[model samples]
Target: MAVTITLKTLQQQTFKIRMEPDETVKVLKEKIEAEKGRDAFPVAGQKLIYAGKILSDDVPIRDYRIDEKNFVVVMVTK
Candidate 1:
């Protein structure tokens, strides 16, 4: 089954992503990068935060309790 999530960037850009619950945070970063363009939102520079916790790249989205109603915050680093 696929889960839909809301991604919010520091700049206030919002994107809706549909992916599997088993997908890793790294994959989520890549998807966001694809939507924003790698140059604008590089996967390497992305930090996903959910429920006041910083998500790890290798961890599954489900582990963070992320779902259709949840929004993940994207922090961009230099």
Candidate 2:
């Protein structure tokens, strides 16, 4: 099953991609990097959220119990 998320970042307005829920936060970071075309940053230092809660990078999307309507807010800037 694929999980979809809605991300509307203030920093990257163009980054409005829908991603699978089973993907890791790390992967999301990569996708964002490509969309933003920014310098490579540390995905490890970043925080991820799902279902209104913070999630670790190692945690799989399947474990997050993601919902299509669920939203995760993460700040990409320092």
Candidate 3:
């Protein structure tokens, strides 16, 4: 299924993107990196979190029980 993901930054800025259920979190970060700018998004330092759980890069969004309305926190560790 295709889902609309909402990514929120620490500054409260949000970005929305469309993705498939089979897509991995790494791909999502790449997309975010492109849309939000590489330096701003920081793919290498990314840590995706949802539902109080730390999401793995290899894991699909569907595995996290995320839907169209879900919010994924985009944190940078660097």
RMSD (Å) of each candidate, 1 decimal: 1.8, 3.6, 2.1
Better of 2 and 3 by TM-score: 3
lDDT at residue 46 of model 2 (Cα atoms): 43
lDDT by residue (1-78, candidate 3, tens digit) is 666777676678776667676777777877777777777666676657788877765677667766657778776654
Q: How far is candidate 2 from the true structure (C-alpha RMSD, Å)?
A: 3.6
Off by over 4 Å in 3: none
Query: Which sequence of candidate numbers ranks them by TM-score, best first?
Result: 1, 3, 2
Worst 10 residues of 3 by lDDT: 40-49
- For model 3 the TM-score comes to 0.76
Deviation of model 2 at 16, angstroms? 4.8
Runs with alpha carbons beyond 4 Å of true place in candidate 1: none
Give TM-scores for every candidate, taking all chains together and pairing residue i with residue i.
Answer: 0.80, 0.54, 0.76
In candidate 2, stretches whose alpha carbon ends up further than 4 angstroms from where it belongs are 1-3, 8-16, 37-41, 76-78
lDDT (10s digit) by residue, model 2, range 1-78? 444555545454423335566777667666655665444333554445665676655565546664555445443543
- Pairwise TM-score winner, candidates 1 and 3: 1
